[PDB]
Write a protein that binds this DNA or RNA. Structure first.
Ligand SMILES: Nc1ccn([C@H]2C[C@H](O)[C@@H](COP(=O)(O)C(F)(F)P(=O)(O)OP(=O)(O)O)O2)c(=O)n1
Ligand SMILES: [Mn+2]
Ligand SMILES: [Mn+2]
Ligand code: NA
Ligand code: NA
Length: 320
DNA sequence: GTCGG
DNA sequence: GCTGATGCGC
DNA sequence: CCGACGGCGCATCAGC
């Protein structure tokens, strides 16, 4: 991109903190820095130039000073050569293996994809599936195939009950040309905030062999593996997430699920300021005393915007 | 790690 | 066996 | 200077 070099650096440091240091807030800091610099209209000639930006503090300015001067970062090269930090990092690339388990595996001597193979017995179902499709889960999904996948899920859903509304959200709804996975928001007239619709839909998607494995399943959330039908050669296996939301709560749901995650954090933060609390369900009033007010009436994504005083931004403009 | 309080 | 911590992920 | 830093769903297993 533009400052890609800098943002790649910050992103690699973020991962290290989350995975090796288990310092989630420094993970978040580094991604906020990366976020702000990514949307900066000029070419960063210096660390000080960057330090003008909110989220970019003293330490990052130095690192950026070094990066621009040296073209690399000693902190990072130190990290790539530390066997342990390198091993822990790689392992978290398996779905279902986080910092804690990656760290445990390494202290046990399990530190490569082959070692996980030998040790399948020590992995939970989710991890086993993470290994099974390790390579495929790292492949991006070209929009074209997204549109295919969409047609398959919308049709199958309609073919369980026509009152279902399924909306593909996430980077797809933001307009990305390739996505990491597919995210589907599901609604139905019989399920509101007042009121087993997800199983029905998951079962149907299984019987046409679109959904190939399950990572988790609940009253409202399904995380699993899917695959476009082949002919020719097989498509890679893809992650799919389905989320059942109550009808009258569809607009918060789809604002949430559309993201991005950084946008969601920034919005949810800049609202608590305006005296509101936005979660994936409602946008409640923040009372003076200390408790959240009742759910405010919503009929649009814009309503949530209007509610806190943020001039609208199309899904395509929420990619932070 | 950063920035408002 | 049950369940609250904890982990992983959206 | 210090400390808060968005909000929530499901699965697992240590410790009774
Ligand atoms: N920490 C998080 C993570 C996610 N989300 C919401 C906001 C997201 O829009 C939505 C999907 O998260 P996703 O895990 O599929 C994602 F982020 F990767 P996506 O944006 O979809 O881009 P892609 O999948 O191509 O990589 O959950 C959130 O609110 N908080
Ligand atoms: Mn996604
Ligand atoms: Mn997803
Ligand atoms: Na700054
Ligand atoms: Na992982």
């Amino acid at each position: 991109t533009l400052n890609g070099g800098i943002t790649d650096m910050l992103t690699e440091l973020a991962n290290f903190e989350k995975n090796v240091s288990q310092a989630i807030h420094k993970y978040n800091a580094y991604r906020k820095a990366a976020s702000v610099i990514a949307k900066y209209p000029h070419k960063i000639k210096s660390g000080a130039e960057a330090k003008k930006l909110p989220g970019v503090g003293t330490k990052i300015a130095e690192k950026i000073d070094e990066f621009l001067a040296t073209g690399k970062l000693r902190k990072l090269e130190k990290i790539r050569q530390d066997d342990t930090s390198s091993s822990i990092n790689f392992l978290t690339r398996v779905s279902g293996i986080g910092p804690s388990a990656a760290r445990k595996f390494v202290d046990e001597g399990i530190k490569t994809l082959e070692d996980l193979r030998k040790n399948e017995d020590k992995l939970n179902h989710h991890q086993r599936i993470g290994l099974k499709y390790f390579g495929d889960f790292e492949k991006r999904i070209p929009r074209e195939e997204m549109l295919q996948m969409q047609d398959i899920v919308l049709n199958e859903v309609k073919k369980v009950d026509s009152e279902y509304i399924a909306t593909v959200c996430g980077s797809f709804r933001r307009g990305a040309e390739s996505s990491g996975d597919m995210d589907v928001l599901l609604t139905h007239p019989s399920f509101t905030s007042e009121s087993k619709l997800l199983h029905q839909v998951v079962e149907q998607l299984q019987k046409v062999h679109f959904i190939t494995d399950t990572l988790s399943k609940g009253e409202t959330k399904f995380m699993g593996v899917c695959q476009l039908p082949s002919k020719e050669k097989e498509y890679p296996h893809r992650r799919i997430d389905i989320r059942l939301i109550p009808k009258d709560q569809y607009y918060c749901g789809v604002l949430y699920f559309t993201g991005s995650d950084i946008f969601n954090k920034n919005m949810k933060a800049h609202a608590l300021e305006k005296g509101f609390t936005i979660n994936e369900y409602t946008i409640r009033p923040l009372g003076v005393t200390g408790v959240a007010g009742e759910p405010l009436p919503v009929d649009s994504e814009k309503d949530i915007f209007d509610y806190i005083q943020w001039k609208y931004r199309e899904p395509k403009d929420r990619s932070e």
